[PDB]
C-alpha cells in the first residue's frame, strides 16, 4: 500500500495537526503575539544589564583604594 | 503617501487619446544599403518594438575546421565587445528593460532584441555593436564551451531533437549533414580565434538583414545607416551543395521505449512556394499528438494520424508527423515513440499511413478542408506576437530578397486540392527512405526490410 | 644572447595575448553614443496609445468588454467567471476542476465528438483553466467566424449535459492527471506552501482536491455548483482582435439568457471564512533526489491594495536567476549577483501572488543539497536589505523592468482579452497604460522602504521544502533573519 | 611626473640595479606579483594562457631553488635572462579597469578577500 | 543612503553614551 | 587547558543522550537551542550561589 | 559553493572555528539539564579564576601576614568580603557542579565507548581540582588550614 510518508507528499491538506502536548495552539484566526514575548525578554534583559554592571563595578572598585589608606590620608 | 486604492483612477493623469479603432495595416519598407545590406521595418499599434538582425550563415557554411561555430556563436551572442564589456551590455539591456535572444539554425541565424518603442536607437546601436564588433575573449569562450559540454551531456532527455539531428546527418551528405549540436571532439577543437575568423569571413554586408516590427522606417534607417554603411562590399560566396541519398541511423540507449522516425526528400524547397505550401498543409493534416495532452479541442485531435493510430492503437507513447523546409530542399516524415516490443508493428503502421496518403481517394474532401482551414488559422494567429512578425520579415528577406505578402500564402492554401496532395505524396514517397532509430533498437527491422515498401 | 620573443612558446603566447588586449583597449564613440548603463526614468506617454476598451453592463448584471482592432484578422472571445477552488465547501474541493473537464464534453446538442469536430473544422482553439478564485473559458477564432465561437461558448456554459459514462472517463483522466503532477515539483511545492500558509482557510485547499472527493461527484454536486456560482453578476465576457462591440453586446444579450439568477456574491462569501496567514513550515526530506527545492514566503497584498504595485516592483528587484541566463554574474538585482557569482543555486525565482484580501511574496530557490545554508543567507540578506537600505538606481531599474515586462507580456489577441477579463474581475475596471505607468513611477526608495517595513520587517514566514534538505536552516533561523540588529 | 631611465640618470641606475638582481635570480619583474597579495593578480593569472603561467611557475621554482642552495644562475643563462619583458601588466590593468567600472555603477565585487 | 547611515551612527552614539553614563554615573560632569 | 582538551575530545565523538542510542538522526544546532537551556541553568545557579 | 565573495561573518576564517564548535555543532535533540551542569562547571571555573586574581591583588603569602591580610580583604577593601565569599563558596559550588556532572555520567554510562578519552581526561581534571582546592585552602593560614 501507500507508504504513508508519500501520502503526505502527494496529499497537501489545509487542516494541519500539530502535537499540542507541550504547547496549546492558538486558534487559527488569532494574530501572532510577537510583543508579549519581546517585552518579557526586555525585562529579563535589563535585569541582566543590572547584574553585569554590578559585577564589573564590584571588581573595579575592589581594585580601587582602601579604607585604611583613606584614613591615613590625614 | 496617500493612494486611491487602485479601484479608482489615480488623481490627475495625462492619459492620451486612444487609437482610431482600425487605424490601418502597416506596410514593410525595405531600403537596400549600397554596400548590399537590407533594412526593413513596419508600423505596429502596440507599444512594443521587436528589432532583429538576421544573417545567412550556419551549419551549412560550417567547415571541418569550425564544425560547431554556429552553436557556439548562439551561446556567445551578447558577450563583451570591443566597445562595451559584458557587464556594461547586460546593464544596458536591464536598464531599458528589454530582452535579448539569439537563434542559430542550419541555414540562417539571428539576434533579436525587444523593448518599448521609445528605445529604438538603443536597440539598434546595441544590436549592431554586438554583431559587427565582437571580442571573442578566451575566458568567456571557455565558460560557454564548458556549458555547451554540459548541455551535450544532458541531451538524451529529449529524443525528438536527437532524432531530427540523426535524420539530417544520415539522409544528407555534406551541407545539411554538418551537425548542429557540436560533437565533443569539435567542442574541444573550437576556439576564440576560430570564432573570430569564421565571423569575419561570413558576417558580411551582402548577407545582413535588419528587420524591425514596431519601428518607423525613417527613424530606423537614420539610426542604422551611420552604423552599417561602411561595411566592405564582398561578392557573396556561393551556398554549399548537399545531396539527399541516405539510409539508416541507429543508436542504442536506455530500455524505456524505442523512438523510430522516417523521412523523405520533396526537393522543392522554399523557392518552390506551391510545393512548400502543400507540404505545410500535408503536415497540418498529418500532425498527430502525444496521447498524453489534456489541453482541449483545436490541438489537432481530429487529424488523420491522431484519429487512426492514437484512437485505435494503444501502448504507443507518441505519434507525430512533421516537416522541415530549407532553401531548395525539404524533409517531411513521421516521428513515432512506442514500446520496444511493438516497434516493428509501429513501423508497419507508419508505412501504411504514409502509403495511404499517397494512393488517391484515401483522403476525404472534409479532411482536406479541415487541414486547409487549420493551416490558414495557424498562420494568421502566428502573425500576431510582433516578435514573430519581425522574424518573418527577416527570414523572408533573407530567402526571397523581399517579403512575400501574406495574401500569397493564403491564396495558395485556398487553392490546394486533393490531386495536389496525392501528387506531392507520390513524389515524396519515391525518394529514398531515410530512417533513424534510438533506444531499444536491437529489435527494430532492418533498413532494407523497411525500404521494401515505398517502392 | 637574450632570445627574441619568436622562440619560447610561452613568450609567443604572451605576445599574442598582449596584442589582443591592446587591440580591445581603444573604444569608439559612434557605437557608444546611446548606451547609458545607468538606469533612468522616461515618459513613454507618446507611445502608450491603445484602442479604448468599451465596457457595457447588461441589466441582468453581465459585463461585456471589448478592445477592437478591426485591422486584424483573428479574435479571442471568452468568459471570465469570478469563481474557483477557493469557493468550495470543504467537501466539494475538486468540483471546479472536474466541472471544467466535463464542460468541455457535451451539451443537449453538441455531442462531444462532433463538438470538437466543429471547433477544429472552423480552425479555432478552445481552452479553459481554473485558478483558486478565477475561472476562464476562452476560444481563439478568426474574423467573420467569431459569432460561431460565441454561440458555442454560450451553449456549453448554459445547456451542458453531463452523462455518467463521460463522468467515469473523466474520473479516470483526472486521476491520471493527479498521478502525473508530482513529477512537476514546483507546483507541488507551491501547493504545500499554500496549504501550510493559509491553513484552515479556503485558500489552503488545493485546486484538484482529494481523490477521495473526486470519486464521489455524481453530477449533483456539479449542477449545484454551476447553479450556485455561475450567476450573471460574477461573469465577464471579453473580446479583442477583429470584433465589434455592438455586435458582441447584441449576441451576448440574445444568447446568455438561461443563466443562474441567484444572490451568492463573492464579496459577501469572502466576508465569511476569510483568508488568514499562519506562519509555519513543512519540509519533506527524501535524500534520494538530486536537487532540493524550497520556498519562503511573507504575507502579500490584496488585488486592490495600493501597495500591490510596490510589491510588484520589489519582486522585480529580486529578479529570477537561471543557470543558463544570459547575464550570468552581471545582473541588476543583488540576489541574482550573489547567487550567480558564488554558484549557490540552480535557479531562483521571486514570486508575488495576489488574491482577495491577502497574497504572497517569496523567492522560490532550487539548489544542490550542500549550498542550502549559504543560499538561505543570501535570500534573507537581500530581502531585509530591501527593508533597510534600498538604492535609487535599483528602484529605477526595477520600475523600468516592471513596465517593460507588463507591456511586452500584453502581446496578441488572447493576451489582451485575458488582461481585460482579469482586470475587470480584480479591480472592476481595466487600468489604462498611462495610469499604470504613473502608479509605478510613484514608487521610489522611500516607498519601497515603507512597504518592506510593512510586509517584511519582523514578520512570520511560511516555508515549504522538498528533497535533500539536511542543510536547510530551521524556522527560527529565517524568523530571526527577518530583521537586522545593526540598524 | 614620469621619470624614465632615458631622462633620468638616477632612474637609469635604479633600473640597472633591478636588472642585475632579477638576472642573478633569473626571474622577470612580473613574477614578483603575489596572487595572494591583491586577488586582482589572481584573476589576471587565471585569465592568462597556461603556457605563460606554467613558465612563471617554473621560473619561480628555479629562483626558490637557487635561493635555498645559496647560489646564483650561471653566467650563461644570466646573460640569457630577459627581465622586464612583461606578460601580466596589460591583463592586470584590464582586470582593474573592469573592477573599477563595476564598482562605479552599481555592482557587487566579483571576488572578495576573506577576513583575514 | 548617507543620511540614513549618519542617522544610524548618531543613534548608536547616543546609545553608547547612555551605556557609558550608566556604567559611570557622573553627576560631577553632568551638573556643569 | 585540561577542560579545553576535555571538550575537544567530546566534540570529536559527539555527545550522548538520555536514551544512550545512536543519535545522528535527529540533531539540532547548539545555538540557540541549547544556549537558552544553559542560560536557564546559569540563572538558577546564580540564585543558588 | 565557491566562496568568491564573503556571505556571512560567521563563516569567515576569523570566526569559522568558533562558528563550528559553538554555534553549529550538532547536538542530540533530547538532552536534559545535566549537560547544562557541564557548562555550569565551566562557568564556575571562570568565576574562580577571576575572583582569585582580584583576591591575590591583596593577599600576602607570608606566615606572619596571611591571616591579617585576609581580614584586611574582609574589612578594609571596598567590597572585599564579596570577593572572598565568592571565592570560597565558589570553590564549594564548583565541586557541587562537578559531582553532579560525574554522577550524570555514571547514570547514563557516558564513559562507555567511544568516550573513554573524555572520561579519562575528566578524571585528570578531577585530580587537578582536588589539588588546587587543597593548596588554596592552605592559603588563609588558620588552624584547620595549617593542620
Ligand atoms: C563574537 C562572535 C560573533 C561576532 C559577530 C558575528 C556576527 O555577525 O554575529 C551575528 C550573526 C548573525 O547571523 P549572520 O548569519 O551573520 O546574519 C547576519 C544578518 O544578515 C545581519 O545581522 P545584524 O546586522 O542584525 O547583526 C550584526 C551584528 C554583528 O555584531 C557586531 O557588529 C558587534 C560588534 C561589537 C560590539 C561590542 C560592544 O551586530 C549587532 O548585533 C549589533 C549589536 C550592537 C550592540 C551590542 C551590545 C553591546 C553591549 C555592550 O550571528 C549570530 O547572531 C550568532 C551568535 C552566536 C553566539 C553563540 C554564543 C554561545 C555561547 C555558549 C557558551 C557555553 C559554551 C561552553 C562553555 C564551557 C566550555 C568549557
Ligand atoms: C521533589 C519535588 C518534585 C515535584 C515535582 C512536581 C512536578 O510535577 O514537576 C514537573 C513539572 C513539569 O514536568 P516536566 O515537563 O517533566 O518538567 C519540565 C521539563 O524539565 C522542561 O522544563 P521547561 O524548560 O519547560 O521549564 C523551565 C523551568 C520552569 O520553571 C520556572 O520557570 C521556575 C521554576 C522555579 C522552581 C522553584 O524549569 C523547570 O521546569 C525545571 C528545571 C529548572 C532548571 C534546573 C537546572 C539545574 C540548576 C542547577 C543549579 C545548581 C545546583 O514541573 C513543575 O511542576 C514545575 C512548575 C510548577 C509551577 C510553577 C510554574 C511557574 C511559571
Ligand atoms: C635619494 C636616493 C635616490 C636613489 C635613486 C636610485 C638609486 C638606485 C641605485 O642603484 O642605487 C645604488 C645602490 C643600490 O644599487 P646597487 O649598487 O646595485 O646595490 C647592490 C650592489 N652594490 O644604493 C641605493 O640604492 C641606496 C639608496 C639609499 C636611499 C636613501 C634615501 C634617504
Ligand atoms: C593602538 C591604540 C588603539 C586604537 C587603534 C586604532 C587603529 C589604528 C590603525 C588603523 C589601521 C586601519 C584600520 C581599518 C582596517 C583596515 C581597512 C581596510 O582597508 O580593510 C580592507 C581589507 C581588505 O578588504 P577588502 O577585500 O578590500 O574588502 C572588500 C570590499 N570591497 O581588510 C582586510 O584585509 C581584513 C583584515 C583583517 C584583520 C584586521 C586586524 C585589525 C587589528 C586588530 C588588532 C586586535 C586583534 C584582536 C585581539 C586583541 C584584542 C585586544
Ligand atoms: C567580535 C565582535 C564583532 C567584530 C566585528 C568586526 C570584525 C572585523 C571586520 C569584519 C568586516 C566588516 O566590515 O564587518 C562589519 C559588518 C559588515 O557587514 P556584512 O554583513 O559583512 O555585509 C554588509 C556590507 N556592508 O557590519 C556589521 O555587521 C554591522 C555592525 C554595525 C555595528 C555598529 C553599532 C555599534 C554601536 C556601539 C556599540 C554598542 C553600543 C551600546 C553599548 C555601549 C558600551 C556600554
Ligand atoms: C574608562 C575610565 C573611566 C574613569 C572615570 O570615569 O572615573 C570616574 C571619575 C570620577 O567620577 P565619580 O567619582 O563617579 O563622580 C564624582 C561624583 N559624581 O570620572 C570623572 O572624573 C569624569 C568622567 C567622565 C566620563 C568619562 C568616560 C570615559
Ligand atoms: C579570544 C579567544 C578566541 C579563541 C578562538 C578559537 C581558538 C583559535 C582557533 C584558531 C584556528 O585554528 O583557526 C583556524 C583558522 C584557519 O583558517 P580556515 O581555513 O578557515 O580553518 C577552518 C578550520 N578547518 O584560523 C584562522 O583563520 C585565523 C584565526 C585567528 C584567531 C581568531 C580568534 C578570534 C579573535 C577575536
Ligand atoms: C572542570 C570541570 C569540568 C568541565 C568544565 C567539564 C566540561 C564539560 C563539557 C563542556 C562537556 C560537554 C557538555 C556536556 O556534555 O555537559 C562535558 C562533557 C562530559 N564530561 Fe566534563 N567537565 C568537567 C569535569 C568532568 C569530570 C570530572 C568528568 C568525569 C571524570 C567529566 C566527564 C564528562 C563526560 C563523560 C562528558 C560526556 C557528556 C555526555 O556524555 O553527554 N567531566 N564536560
Ligand atoms: C588562578 C586563579 C586563582 C587564584 C589566583 C586564586 C587565589 C587565591 C587566593 C589568593 C586565595 C586566598 C584568599 C582567601 O583566603 O580567600 C585563595 C583561596 C582559595 N582558593 Fe583560590 N585561586 C584561584 C583559583 C581557585 C580555584 C580554581 C579553586 C578551586 C575551586 C580555588 C580554591 C580556593 C579555596 C578553597 C580557597 C580557600 C577559601 C578560603 O579563603 O577559605 N581557587 N585563592
Ligand atoms: Zn485537469
Short mmCIF file of N, CA and C in Angstrom, two decimals, chain B residues 16 117-118 219, chain C residues 43-49:
data_model
loop_
_atom_site.label_atom_id
_atom_site.label_comp_id
_atom_site.label_asym_id
_atom_site.label_seq_id
_atom_site.Cartn_x
_atom_site.Cartn_y
_atom_site.Cartn_z
N UNK B 16 -3.41 59.54 -22.83
CA UNK B 16 -3.62 60.05 -24.19
C UNK B 16 -4.83 59.42 -24.86
N UNK B 117 8.85 51.04 -27.61
CA UNK B 117 9.15 51.76 -28.84
C UNK B 117 10.00 53.00 -28.60
N UNK B 118 10.08 53.48 -27.36
CA UNK B 118 10.89 54.66 -27.08
C UNK B 118 12.36 54.40 -27.35
N UNK B 219 13.13 56.56 -38.83
CA UNK B 219 13.96 56.53 -37.63
C UNK B 219 14.96 55.38 -37.68
N UNK C 43 9.39 59.16 -20.02
CA UNK C 43 7.96 59.38 -20.19
C UNK C 43 7.54 58.79 -21.53
N UNK C 44 6.98 57.58 -21.49
CA UNK C 44 6.51 56.91 -22.69
C UNK C 44 5.10 57.33 -23.08
N UNK C 45 4.65 58.50 -22.62
CA UNK C 45 3.28 58.93 -22.90
C UNK C 45 3.02 59.03 -24.40
N UNK C 46 4.04 59.40 -25.17
CA UNK C 46 3.91 59.45 -26.62
C UNK C 46 3.69 58.07 -27.24
N UNK C 47 3.91 57.00 -26.48
CA UNK C 47 3.83 55.65 -27.02
C UNK C 47 2.60 54.89 -26.52
N UNK C 48 2.16 55.12 -25.28
CA UNK C 48 1.08 54.33 -24.70
C UNK C 48 -0.27 54.70 -25.30
N UNK C 49 -0.52 54.28 -26.53
CA UNK C 49 -1.78 54.55 -27.20
C UNK C 49 -2.38 53.23 -27.66
#
